[PDB]
Design a binder for this molecule. Sequence first.
Ligand SMILES: *[C@@H]1O[C@H](CO)[C@@H](O[C@@H]2O[C@H](CO)[C@@H](O[C@@H]3O[C@H](CO[C@H]4O[C@H](CO)[C@@H](O)[C@H](O)[C@@H]4O)[C@@H](O)[C@H](O[C@H]4O[C@H](CO)[C@@H](O)[C@H](O)[C@@H]4O)[C@@H]3O)[C@H](O)[C@H]2NC(C)=O)[C@H](O)[C@H]1NC(C)=O
Ligand SMILES: Cc1ccc(Cc2noc([C@H]3CC[C@H](Nc4ncnc5[nH]ncc45)C3)n2)cc1
Ligand SMILES: *[C@@H]1O[C@H](CO)[C@@H](O)[C@H](O)[C@H]1NC(C)=O
Ligand SMILES: *[C@@H]1O[C@H](CO)[C@@H](O)[C@H](O)[C@H]1NC(C)=O
Ligand SMILES: *[C@@H]1O[C@H](CO)[C@@H](O)[C@H](O)[C@H]1NC(C)=O
Ligand code: NA
Ligand code: NA
Ligand code: NA
Ligand code: NA
Ligand code: NA
Lengths: 357, 352
Amino acid sequence: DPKIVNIGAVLSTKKHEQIFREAVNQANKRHFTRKIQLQATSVTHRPNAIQMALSVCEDLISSQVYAILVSHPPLTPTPISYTAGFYRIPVIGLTTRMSIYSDKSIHLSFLRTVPPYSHQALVWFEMMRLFNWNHVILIVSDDHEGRAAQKKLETLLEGPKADKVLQFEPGTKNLTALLLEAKELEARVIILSASEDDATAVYKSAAMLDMTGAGYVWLVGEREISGSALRYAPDGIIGLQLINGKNESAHISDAVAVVAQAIHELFEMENITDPPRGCVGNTNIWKTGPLFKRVLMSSKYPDGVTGRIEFNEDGDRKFAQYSIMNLQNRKLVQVGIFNGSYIIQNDRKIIWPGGET
Amino acid sequence: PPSIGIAVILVGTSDEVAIKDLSVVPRVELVAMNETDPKSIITRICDLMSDRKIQGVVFADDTDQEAIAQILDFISAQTLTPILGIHGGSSMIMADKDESSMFFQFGPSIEQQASVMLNIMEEYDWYIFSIVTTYFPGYQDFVNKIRSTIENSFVGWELEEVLLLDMSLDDGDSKIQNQLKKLQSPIILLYCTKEEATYIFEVANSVGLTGYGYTWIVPSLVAGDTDTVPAEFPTGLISVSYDEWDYGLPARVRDGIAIITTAASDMLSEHSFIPEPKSSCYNTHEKRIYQSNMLNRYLINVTFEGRDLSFSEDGYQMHPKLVIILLNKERKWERVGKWKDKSLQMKYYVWP
Ligand SMILES: *[C@@H]1O[C@H](CO)[C@@H](O[C@@H]2O[C@H](CO)[C@@H](O[C@@H]3O[C@H](CO[C@H]4O[C@H](CO)[C@@H](O)[C@H](O)[C@@H]4O)[C@@H](O)[C@H](O[C@H]4O[C@H](CO)[C@@H](O)[C@H](O)[C@@H]4O)[C@@H]3O)[C@H](O)[C@H]2NC(C)=O)[C@H](O)[C@H]1NC(C)=O
Ligand SMILES: Cc1ccc(Cc2noc([C@H]3CC[C@H](Nc4ncnc5[nH]ncc45)C3)n2)cc1
Ligand SMILES: *[C@@H]1O[C@H](CO)[C@@H](O)[C@H](O)[C@H]1NC(C)=O
Ligand SMILES: *[C@@H]1O[C@H](CO)[C@@H](O)[C@H](O)[C@H]1NC(C)=O
Ligand SMILES: *[C@@H]1O[C@H](CO)[C@@H](O)[C@H](O)[C@H]1NC(C)=O
Ligand code: NA
Ligand code: NA
Ligand code: NA
Ligand code: NA
Ligand code: NA
């Protein structure tokens, strides 16, 4: 007769709900569960935020969950983050890449198995070191996301330096004033941080200003080589792709493995209190919440499906792996991988805007 | 004139009888709410919408539960219904309100309070100080306000230290204690929640920082319900409070009803329409292309009985008459000053 410790989840589909139920089962199989045994509790995303918040209370907090796994909906993890945060119940983001969830003030008990987009600056930095791009021009959107990338790239740079940083208003379709300012500089390495629709805007104007050809280097993230951004992207661009970043199944495995370990680690300590049973009539935080957060934050699982799972000072994923993509003859060709710490070039040659620098 | 449905939600003990004392007319309904958790508040407001068809909500509570501001902002933006946090946890300082928010609070802002704190310091020539914040939303806006104010003052202010305490983790390692030992200033400005402040103070006492020669200035939310005084609060603690004394609950409810009614009358007598009170919280996704926060331009600058009830760009009251309070020996909050209009009027020249 062990103690049943529930783990909650807000997932995309019933297949994903079954994958979660299996991941938890396997965890119980692989751990010593005489004392504590896990139980999966889950729901799929609700049509709207009010219904989603209500679902967390009715379906998960009602079951006294110790943590809630959240996949990015096919709507945001925020109603989940706020409801769970209210009680200090940790939330594990599986596919949310937006840098705002790294905000400890608003998202006060949140960890993610995927890094925020701002973390691609770690790859660009290694790339700059490798190709000896000591002078760069950084173009960012004047939104939380764009500033997150700047703030992060700037941190790594403070060797290689950013000659100028240019911010633009999200939704601006004519950026030839921004891009002409960039063309005047000696630096020909342009780094871009912008949403798919804003990346398109930059791409079109840069082409009109003949800045997408030989001489220039375009270094970019995942969003900027996705959807409409890819239709107007200059041939020779360098983009990124977070390996398994959209694989909710791989992230369910890994999050459960991590949570299962942390639960068992937690119960090695004394005076572990249960979370509140439901929302109604409960306005007190879970006293064990903050300790369980510390335990999770400091958890390492190296044999994860998506790699070495570790969390940074913001509970964001460390040692994420990316595909270094190069647009060659309007085809997205992988030219290497950022393995979590090092750049590994593959036998496919990089074609730079034009030919070879 | 046509009628508008206004719901007055009152969490806790209230004199409903005392409380019961244009182009459109209000049809008010006093609602008593028992619980303040997310489910209860979301459910209560949603059921009221479902029956009466509510043009706006006037909310008041007796709690030290500042999350009610967040819950109410969330409800407000999702349903696109005006909500006025007229007292308690609902009127306390918050994170950045939603782009689509229609939440307005009777309390003072982060930056307003921060200035009031420096005004107290200038008065008693308390120029040497430190700041200690947690991650509570706006902590950077608080530090930045002080810093900007300080760096343009031809006064000899000296901000010795700025501590950032992570309260989201367990303090078994004694990290907070080691950080608090860094403090050397006679004046400490503490920005955090009432719950966080009780822990911080228990620690600060261990390190001998709550005693004589150490003064702690704190914002409205740390004092909160002046009738709930944590034992760990230091005697001689200075705080800002929104005048629960002279701006009593019935006046606030009346002013809340006035704001919604005026705003609605204005939009009607200008656009020949008002926003339709949506009868569901479970259809928000479907009908958002039909809804907007248009009423905010009318809600933000209402004047009634000559009293200027206008709100800031961030949804806090524009001109609040704040009250400076001191936690005395009999562990009770005492009035020691007033902040009316850019000017501070204190009780004492020298503190006893
Ligand atoms: C991402 O890619 C990096 C780069 O390759 C990987 O890091 C290397 O990982 C390997 C294997 O774990 C490490 O190899 C071991 O190196 C030891 C000596 O290391 C020193 O020298 C290297 C090179 O100059 C430096 O990089 C390093 O910092 C040290 O100063 C050897 O002692 C080891 O040999 C023993 O074990 C091997 C098997 O592991 C046996 O074959 C041997 O016979 C022997 O008993 C071994 O060669 C290497 O040190 C790591 N390099 C760095 C930079 O840290 C990451 O592992 C990879 N990550 C992922 C997720 O794939
Ligand atoms: C749908 C819904 C919406 C709102 C609510 C209430 C709520 N509970 O949590 C939150 C978040 C908002 C930011 C807030 N951060 C902090 N609150 C207190 N003390 C703190 N210290 N450091 C940071 C901090 C937590 N909101 C619940 C459900
Ligand atoms: C997603 O990850 C799982 C491993 O957990 C695996 O079954 C599947 O092959 C992966 N999907 C893709 C597209 O590779
Ligand atoms: C709230 O408390 C009062 C106490 O008299 C009670 O009558 C009322 O039924 C309670 N509300 C609910 C929702 O049950
Ligand atoms: C405030 O309201 C009055 C209503 O008489 C209006 O004339 C004035 O222009 C408004 N001010 C602003 C800044 O909108
Ligand atoms: Na087992
Ligand atoms: Na975090
Ligand atoms: Na290659
Ligand atoms: Na009309
Ligand atoms: Na709309």
